[PDB]
Amino acid sequence: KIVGGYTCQENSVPYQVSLNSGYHFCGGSLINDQWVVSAAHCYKSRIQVRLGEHNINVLEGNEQFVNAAKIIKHPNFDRKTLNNDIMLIKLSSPVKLNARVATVALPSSCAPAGTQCLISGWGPDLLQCLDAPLLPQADCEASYPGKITDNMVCVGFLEGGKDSCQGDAGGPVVCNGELQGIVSWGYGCALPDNPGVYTKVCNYVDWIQDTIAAN
Amino acid sequence: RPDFCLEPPYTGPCKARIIRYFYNAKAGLCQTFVYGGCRAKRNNFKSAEDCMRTCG
Ligand SMILES: [Ca+2]
């Protein structure tokens, strides 16, 4: 699970979703009543989206289960370097937004290093949360020599201890109410000098809006 | 038996949670492991039949 994290207060992360194809394999974010944003390495031909979840193993009553109608990965996704690790999912029908199911805002601009963010995901299986800062690009590049592109950002602590892990990919990194990152990759989890690397969403706002409008 | 069949399972850097199969030499059969979603090595199968056929 998210290491060094804490259990999120019940339904305190209403934009968080679970990607299911028989079992939970990735996370995602609801950016509007019919579209979800996640990571491209979370791609599967058939995906069921589960919203309003807290305990992923029990039917609590506020969950909405919707099948994905369209899965669109970034045209420039690279499965080896992981550059442009972003994917859009259109739901079968619009979901009902409430206190347990809501949307998150796309970034107004790129958040600066030092900005405190909230990472969430599942890895009872309850939603886990983590407070961590966006790290400076130079600290990111130094942790992963020659592997960081301008579309990636590092979030966490260079001393390890706190990090996102397997089961969290596609999940949100929200800073000041705006989605600024998507859980993507890293070397190990919570390993010192190897903080999680995330997709820099501010670099895709236009692609995201263009794609949604056209589909 | 191919050498990639003796290598330990490789989760990878990605953080997806995908269940795959790998040949466990120590045990003598194919078992499941959590695959991260990218950079899969060869001892990584989508099923036990393929794993057993290939490395068995
Ligand atoms: Ca539930």
Side-chain angles (χ1 to χ4, degrees), chain A residues 138-149:
Chain A
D139 290 348
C140 193
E141 296 175 340
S143 279
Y144 300 90
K147 308 281 163 143
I148 303 298
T149 74

Side-chain angles (χ1 to χ4, degrees), chain B residues 8-27:
Chain B
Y10 184 66
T11 283
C14 286
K15 302 173 171 185
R17 179 260 204 132
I18 300 155
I19 309 292
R20 291 288 172 89
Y21 288 95
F22 87 106
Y23 188 76
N24 184 343
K26 194 198 181 147

Side-chain angles (χ1 to χ4, degrees), chain A residues 12-99 101-149 151-203:
Chain A
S12 79
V13 188
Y15 44 88
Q16 172 84 234
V17 324
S18 172
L19 300 195
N20 194 289
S21 210
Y23 61 86
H24 166 84
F25 69 92
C26 274
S29 292
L30 189 70
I31 52 172
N32 90 26
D33 70 356
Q34 250 209 125
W35 287 89
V36 165
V37 65
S38 186
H41 80 252
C42 283
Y43 170 85
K44 272 186 203 199
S45 60
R46 261 178 297 252
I47 298 175
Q48 174 176 80
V49 186
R50 296 179 179 196
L51 316 101
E53 297 260 26
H54 184 48
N55 179 343
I56 211 95
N57 301 312
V58 167
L59 182 65
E60 296 142 313
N62 323 116
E63 305 104 332
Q64 284 176 49
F65 288 47
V66 197
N67 277 32
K70 301 203 199 139
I71 301 149
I72 305 146
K73 316 196 280 178
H74 191 279
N76 297 141
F77 173 51
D78 193 310
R79 330 173 150 253
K80 208 201 150 170
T81 69
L82 296 163
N83 194 26
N84 302 128
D85 192 9
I86 182 175
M87 172 174 86
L88 285 181
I89 301 173
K90 190 194 197 183
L91 267 17
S92 271
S93 37
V95 307
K96 204 222 153 291
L97 302 174
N98 47 54
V101 177
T103 70
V104 54
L106 284 184
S108 273
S109 66
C110 295
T115 305
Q116 272 285 129
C117 309
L118 171 71
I119 302 113
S120 51
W122 278 277
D125 207 15
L126 314 150
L127 186 61
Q128 298 297 106
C129 275
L130 178 77
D131 299 300
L134 292 180
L135 296 168
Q137 211 54 3
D139 290 348
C140 193
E141 296 175 340
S143 279
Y144 300 90
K147 308 281 163 143
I148 303 298
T149 74
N151 300 306
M152 305 172 195
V153 70
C154 279
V155 187
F157 321 79
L158 310 159
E159 324 176 320
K162 305 184 175 170
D163 215 349
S164 58
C165 213
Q166 273 67 48
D168 292 315
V173 185
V174 166
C175 329
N176 297 310
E178 300 183 333
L179 193 72
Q180 300 273 337
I182 291 169
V183 174
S184 198
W185 66 279
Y187 296 161
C189 303
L191 284 202
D193 194 42
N194 276 298
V197 182
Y198 301 72
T199 307
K200 202 144 110 208
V201 174
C202 58
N203 278 358

